[PDB]
Design a protein around this ligand. Structure first.
Ligand SMILES: Nc1nc2c(ncn2[C@@H]2O[C@H](COP(=O)(O)OP(=O)(O)O)[C@@H](O)[C@H]2O)c(=O)[nH]1
Ligand SMILES: [Mg+2]
Length: 166
């Protein structure tokens, strides 16, 4: 409870949420019995221990699970694919949706452009991701979950952001 961070992955189908979540996990004694699509890992960030509870239960078709995700997170990773415009536009919709669900809280958010390895398929530019993050007042990163590029920096980044709002 200060050492602990509940982090929620949201985004359109096929953007890479589950692939991100799997890289994050892999290998004790947190109080929480993990359910559905929940992962726990304890991380060292800036010389301080961080227990992350990661939720990856956002699907596009349990309808209440959307409202659940939007309510329980301390922090959010709003994921789109650089090779998919509509997922990028969806990300803005989800950010607005999240802001309405949490009107009075300063929620740490990272906007994540996944699939950066798919160079010839890029449809969304780095500048667009950046400009969008500026409009949203959140952070931005591009990852490739397939090759584990910037995935470490991402989860360090989100812990770093939630600590700044204390
Ligand atoms: N090339 C590439 N493929 C990816 C990346 N991340 C995920 N994928 C692929 O995209 C497909 C759907 O990914 P998934 O993680 O299930 O998306 P989800 O719906 O958001 O959970 C899978 O076949 C993954 O192999 C990435 O960074 N690069
Ligand atoms: Mg998934």
């Amino acid at each position: 409870g200060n050492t602990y961070y509940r982090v929620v992955l949201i985004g359109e189908q096929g953007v890479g949420k589950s692939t991100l979540a799997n890289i994050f996990a892999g290998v004790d004694s947190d109080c929480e019995v993990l359910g559905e699509d929940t992962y726990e890992r304890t991380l060292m960030v800036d010389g301080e221990s961080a227990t992350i509870i990661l939720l990856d239960m956002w699907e596009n078709k349990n309808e209440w699970l959307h409202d659940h995700c939007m309510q329980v997170g301390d922090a959010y990773l709003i994921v789109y694919s650089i090779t998919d415009r509509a997922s990028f536009e969806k990300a803005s919709e989800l950010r607005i949706q999240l802001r309405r669900a949490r009107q009075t809280e300063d929620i740490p958010i990272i906007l994540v452009g996944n699939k950066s390895d798919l160079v010839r398929c890029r449809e969304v530019s780095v500048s667009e991701g950046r400009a969008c993050a500026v409009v949203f007042d959140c952070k931005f990163i591009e990852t490739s979950a397939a090759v584990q590029h910037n995935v470490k920096e991402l989860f360090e980044g989100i812990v770093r952001q939630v600590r700044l709002r204390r």
